């Protein structure tokens, strides 16, 4: 049939990002509309702003095809960087976890060389790519994680082009997190190529979503 997508205690944010508690029955192939709660409990476990949330929340309302794929393999695409980053705020069953669709790239051997990863959308469908940018509360943690203080994150596509810089500032304490991670998303049309170049503070994507907005 075409029943609605039930999110339960989860919001669209934690659902699409891969919140460690929002990873059950969410692999549904198609749905007509989304049903959540007036005040969801599980979403962005790591505090941060979700850019273009309403736009994304409306694009994913009616979906006819929906499958996720490892756009960047964890054990294959990040040799010089550490990928096993886990946060206490995104705890799951008494264990510090992280988003399953994103990767917290940090330094390896005290070094963070600039990376350049690209992806060609050869799937004949529209791909939803999501990424984050970390903002440490102090510059001491900025150097500990990414080795550099002048970090840049450039995300360039055929229909998207934006550069990011960290705003080092001590935010209010939310879930024992005085830093922030801003979440950004874009739709990659068939044939488009998205580029990721960064030297720090990049929350790299792991699983994208090849979808098609239909009935």
């Amino acid at each position: 049939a075409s029943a609605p997508l039930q999110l339960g205690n989860c919001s669209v944010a934690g659902w699409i990002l891969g919140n460690p508690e929002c990873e059950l029955l969410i692999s549904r192939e198609s749905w007509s509309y989304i049903v959540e709660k007036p005040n969801p409990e599980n979403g962005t476990c790591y505090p941060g702003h979700f850019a273009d949330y309403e736009e994304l929340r409306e694009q994913l309302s009616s979906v006819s095809s929906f499958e996720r794929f490892e756009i960047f393999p964890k054990e294959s695409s990040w040799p010089n960087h550490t990928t096993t980053g886990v946060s206490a705020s995104c705890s799951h069953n008494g264990e510090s976890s992280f988003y399953k669709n994103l990767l917290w790239l940090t330094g390896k051997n005290g070094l963070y060389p600039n990376l350049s990863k690209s992806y060609a959308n050869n799937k004949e469908k529209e791909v939803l790519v999501l990424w984050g940018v970390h903002h440490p509360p102090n510059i001491g943690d900025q150097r500990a994680l990414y080795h550099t203080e002048n970090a840049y994150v450039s995300v360039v596509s055929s229909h998207y082009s934006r550069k990011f810089t960290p705003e080092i500032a001590k935010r209010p304490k939310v879930r024992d997190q005085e830093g922030r991670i801003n979440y950004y998303w874009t739709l990659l049309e068939p044939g488009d190529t998205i580029i990721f170049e960064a030297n720090g503070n990049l929350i790299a994507p792991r699983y994208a979503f090849a979808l098609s907005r239909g009935f």
Epitope: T82, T84, G85, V86, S87, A88, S96, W104, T106, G107, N109, G110, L111, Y112, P136, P137, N138, G140, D141, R143, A144, L145, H147, K170, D176, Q177, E178, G179
Partner: antibody, heavy 130, light 109 residues
Framework: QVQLQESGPGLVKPSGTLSLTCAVS?????????WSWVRQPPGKGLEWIGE???????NYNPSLKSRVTISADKSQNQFSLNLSSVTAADTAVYYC???????????????????????WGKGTTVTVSG | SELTQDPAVSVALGQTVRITCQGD??????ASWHQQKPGQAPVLVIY???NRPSGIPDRFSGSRSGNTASLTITGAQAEDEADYYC????????????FGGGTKLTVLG
Amino acid sequence: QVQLQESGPGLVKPSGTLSLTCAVSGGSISSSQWWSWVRQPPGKGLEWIGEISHGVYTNYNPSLKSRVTISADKSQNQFSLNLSSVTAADTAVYYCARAPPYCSSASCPDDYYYFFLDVWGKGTTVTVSG
Amino acid sequence: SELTQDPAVSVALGQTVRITCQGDSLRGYYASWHQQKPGQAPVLVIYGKNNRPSGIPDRFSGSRSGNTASLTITGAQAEDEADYYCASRDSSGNHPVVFGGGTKLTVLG
């Protein structure tokens, strides 16, 4: 992989200045890691002196901050230790070691709240006698 | 904000011993354990919170219960007779490094 190697005079006159040098291969002094100095008096435990991150950032023991300077030479991949106004209580074996990066705040991955000295040097003996 | 250890402890061959290292600074950073044999440089046996480096036997294990950190040697051997120092960072000011008083482990095989 990473190998350390101390180098010093082995003998310093009292009230003098001790100068050591820890050559490092297989690693980079300029990294986010904390390249540290640790000493051990004869028949006593380990005492932490200081550390240097990147090639510029330092941190010292409050019990000896007033006479310790740790510098780094990025060109030769070496970092040195300076200790002035030395006395008989400074005679010890001096080691250089490597420490992991750490976060001062609680907003980091869990692997950034360790402290350890995985890579040590053979250590050099320094006697303050005159 | 100081680390305290037992000055000396003994264990027979094949028996289990637990070295305890207490301190208020263990509530902000994990506790490591370094082994030092006479005439040798220290060797790291525990990264922290029961994480061993490559080449360390699994009979070494760590544990933490609040302000106390414990190193456990299961089935002690003769070559485990050495000095053991705990270490971490203080959670105040510029975060200095604190070392423990040390523990002389004597194997009585």
